[PDB]
Amino acid sequence: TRTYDREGFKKRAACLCFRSEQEDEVLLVSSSRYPDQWIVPGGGMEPEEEPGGAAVREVYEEAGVKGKLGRLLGIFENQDRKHRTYVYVLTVTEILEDWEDSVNIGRKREWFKVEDAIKVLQCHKPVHAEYLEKLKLG
């Protein structure tokens, strides 16, 4: 149940989950398309979610955490896969042992220091790295 921009772009929402306000360590999940890698949790916006809504709902399902929705880091495009992702920063404040994409699809999770996160990212998902590279691109 996908939704689309005024310009033909599938609306997506993602969220960089930090373990602290310091934003030093971000939580990545295993890919759905390719189990052997990591990603910044996020997904399509539903029939009528506010970008923030889809942000939160996505990390819950995919990463299985809950936390304080911070700023809109930015809208991030993808023209190999006509997408746009509202990316937010979330301070995780409730770790769940059981989340729904864990015990359904086999989604794995775990922290990385922002630089290291970027490295394991730019390999298969470079737009995701662009996210973390917007932090120092202030």
Distances from the Cα of 91 to the Cα of 11, 16, 21, 31, 42, angstroms: 23, 8, 6, 22, 15
What are the beta bridge partners of residue 89? Answer: 16
CATH code of domain 1-138: 3.90.79.10
- Technique employed here was X-ray
* Residue numbers annotated as active site: 61
Distances from the Cα of 79 to the Cα of 9, 16, 43, 104, angstroms: 9, 21, 16, 30
**58 carries a ligand binding annotation:** yes
Residue carrying structure tokens 């030093």: 24
Q: CA 17 to CA 59: how far, in whole Å?
A: 8
**2 carries a ligand binding annotation:** yes
Q: Contact at 8 Å (CB) between 69 and 53?
A: no
Q: CA 5 to CA 129: how far, in whole Å?
A: 23
Q: CA 12 to CA 22: how far, in whole Å?
A: 26
Q: CA 59 to CA 63: how far, in whole Å?
A: 5
**46 carries a ligand binding annotation:** no
**125 carries a ligand binding annotation:** yes
136 contact partners, CB below 8 Å, separation of at least 6: none
Residue carrying structure tokens 């960089």: 16
What are the beta bridge partners of residue 116? Answer: none
Q: Contact at 8 Å (CB) between 50 and 89?
A: no
**102 carries a ligand binding annotation:** no
In 3-state terms the chain splits into helix, strand, coil percentages (rounded to 5) of 25, 40, 40
Burial 12-36 (b: 16+ CB within 10 A, else e): bbbbbbbbeeeeebbbbbbeeeeee
106 contact partners, CB below 8 Å, separation of at least 6: 30, 35
Q: CA 122 to CA 2: how far, in whole Å?
A: 26
